[PDB]
Design a protein around this motif. Sequence first.
Motif, PDB file in Angstrom:
ATOM      1  N   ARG A 187       0.624   4.349   1.852  1.00 45.04           N
ATOM      2  CA  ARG A 187       1.552   3.099   1.715  1.00 45.04           C
ATOM      3  C   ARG A 187       0.487   2.130   1.036  1.00 45.04           C
ATOM      4  O   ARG A 187       0.429   0.961   1.820  1.00 45.04           O
ATOM      5  CB  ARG A 187       2.154   2.563   3.182  1.00 45.04           C
ATOM      6  N   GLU A 188      -0.183   2.521   0.288  1.00 41.29           N
ATOM      7  CA  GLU A 188      -1.233   1.879  -0.483  1.00 41.29           C
ATOM      8  C   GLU A 188      -0.671   0.496  -1.467  1.00 41.29           C
ATOM      9  O   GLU A 188      -1.673   0.029  -2.070  1.00 41.29           O
ATOM     10  CB  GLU A 188      -2.057   2.583  -1.164  1.00 41.29           C
ATOM     11  N   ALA A 189       0.493   0.617  -1.765  1.00 43.12           N
ATOM     12  CA  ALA A 189       1.148  -0.679  -2.258  1.00 43.12           C
ATOM     13  C   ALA A 189       1.092  -1.687  -1.073  1.00 43.12           C
ATOM     14  O   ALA A 189       1.221  -2.813  -1.621  1.00 43.12           O
ATOM     15  CB  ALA A 189       2.670  -0.012  -2.521  1.00 43.12           C
ATOM     16  N   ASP A 190       1.294  -1.483  -0.012  1.00 38.33           N
ATOM     17  CA  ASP A 190       1.304  -2.373   1.225  1.00 38.33           C
ATOM     18  C   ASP A 190      -0.207  -2.550   1.651  1.00 38.33           C
ATOM     19  O   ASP A 190      -0.434  -3.736   2.162  1.00 38.33           O
ATOM     20  CB  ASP A 190       2.267  -1.870   2.273  1.00 38.33           C
ATOM     21  N   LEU A 236      -0.509  -5.550  -0.058  1.00 37.64           N
ATOM     22  CA  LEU A 236       0.389  -6.638   0.311  1.00 37.64           C
ATOM     23  C   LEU A 236      -0.450  -7.185   1.398  1.00 37.64           C
ATOM     24  O   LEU A 236      -0.132  -8.552   1.832  1.00 37.64           O
ATOM     25  CB  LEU A 236       1.688  -6.147   0.818  1.00 37.64           C
ATOM     26  N   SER A 240       7.697  -8.759   3.291  1.00 36.34           N
ATOM     27  CA  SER A 240       6.629  -9.447   2.609  1.00 36.34           C
ATOM     28  C   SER A 240       6.316 -10.671   2.869  1.00 36.34           C
ATOM     29  O   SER A 240       5.418 -11.285   2.550  1.00 36.34           O
ATOM     30  CB  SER A 240       6.830  -9.209   1.079  1.00 36.34           C
ATOM     31  N   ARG A 288      -5.530  10.767  -3.218  1.00 34.58           N
ATOM     32  CA  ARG A 288      -4.135  10.774  -3.556  1.00 34.58           C
ATOM     33  C   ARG A 288      -3.548  12.318  -3.921  1.00 34.58           C
ATOM     34  O   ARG A 288      -2.612  12.847  -3.253  1.00 34.58           O
ATOM     35  CB  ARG A 288      -3.333   9.707  -4.289  1.00 34.58           C
ATOM     36  N   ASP A 309       4.176   8.519  -7.428  1.00 32.35           N
ATOM     37  CA  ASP A 309       4.388   7.209  -8.321  1.00 32.35           C
ATOM     38  C   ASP A 309       5.463   6.423  -6.943  1.00 32.35           C
ATOM     39  O   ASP A 309       5.564   7.017  -5.956  1.00 32.35           O
ATOM     40  CB  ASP A 309       5.283   7.433  -9.467  1.00 32.35           C
ATOM     41  N   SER A 310       5.925   5.257  -7.249  1.00 35.26           N
ATOM     42  CA  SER A 310       6.672   4.364  -6.340  1.00 35.26           C
ATOM     43  C   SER A 310       7.920   4.466  -6.710  1.00 35.26           C
ATOM     44  O   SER A 310       9.010   3.870  -5.992  1.00 35.26           O
ATOM     45  CB  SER A 310       6.198   2.920  -6.373  1.00 35.26           C
ATOM     46  N   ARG A 367       9.351   7.634  -4.751  1.00 36.40           N
ATOM     47  CA  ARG A 367       9.248   7.395  -3.337  1.00 36.40           C
ATOM     48  C   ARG A 367      10.367   7.904  -2.612  1.00 36.40           C
ATOM     49  O   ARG A 367       9.870   8.488  -1.560  1.00 36.40           O
ATOM     50  CB  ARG A 367       8.830   6.144  -3.007  1.00 36.40           C
TER      51      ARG A 367
END
Lengths: 107, 65, 61, 57, 61
Positions: free
Chosen positions: A61-64, A67, A106, C57, E39-40, E43
Amino acid sequence: KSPNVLLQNLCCRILGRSEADVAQQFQYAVRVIGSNFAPTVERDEFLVAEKIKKELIRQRREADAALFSELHRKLHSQGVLKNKWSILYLLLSLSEDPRRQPSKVSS
Amino acid sequence: AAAAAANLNAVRETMDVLLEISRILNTGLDMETLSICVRLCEQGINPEALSSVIKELRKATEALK
Amino acid sequence: RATNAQFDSPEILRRLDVRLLEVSPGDTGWDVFSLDYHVDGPIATVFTRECMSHYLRVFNF
Amino acid sequence: LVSGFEATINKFDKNFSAHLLDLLARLSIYSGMASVISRLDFNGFYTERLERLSAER
Amino acid sequence: LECSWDELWNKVQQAQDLDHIIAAHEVFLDTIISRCLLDSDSRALLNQLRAVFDQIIELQN
């Protein structure tokens, strides 16, 4: 506030029982917190911040994980916390694993 | 005054950011319990002790209550 | 030792080593198992840290 | 007898197990080179008496 | 992992400087990172594959 009436609210938040119900739980809370009211480690919010990184790397969850840096910048910018290290240490200690299907608001 | 309202605005801000941090880690705290713990951090408290207390009381309300 | 992958060049048999991510209260061991395979020297210019992170990843999936 | 024979042996066995645990504690910080630990308890005994003595913060 | 490896192997066999090895290795990475579900925008497919992986272990119980 004052800690003796404040710990009673913690006994009322977690338990569903009031303070006129039980008195062993308040005494166990006074047993731990009284005589262990001083931080036995000194503050480093950086080390606990880089383990919330490694937890969001662990969950992919490395987009977060990027964040979280905006949540950590804010805490320093307000400065109304006595220790910004302590509450992070509390929230990491109370962690779990909500892996599989992210959700974030967020702000 | 004015700085007496700026501090309440800042506490409403910080509790909302800390609520995001508490929910993404899936802790048991919500907006009401988190304020108790922040008020505890104002006086100065060992969080190593506080988390063990909360770890016990949640098990003592799923075995007693 | 059990497999016959012990006759290789000694370097690559040294380069791999198990790399923990972290310890969490409650997680099965599979997600917190990943090999390191770091390499340095002049070879590190092709393969930096940034390469191994994206490879973490892909190894994960 | 018991005061010239047994009690000193019991005291010695206690103290030797104690020093054994102290040395294993001071060797757990030190990690190839971990095989000093592995050799010392090859069968595996006097390293699962208790992990560490319990306390609370 | 085989066509991407072919794409990498021909570009490293022709590499007349280090920059070709680097600039080919990154493309070889950047197609594996997209053909795998990492990718996102994909997801949702990952979460659904987690559901597949969960019903597998449900069947054993």
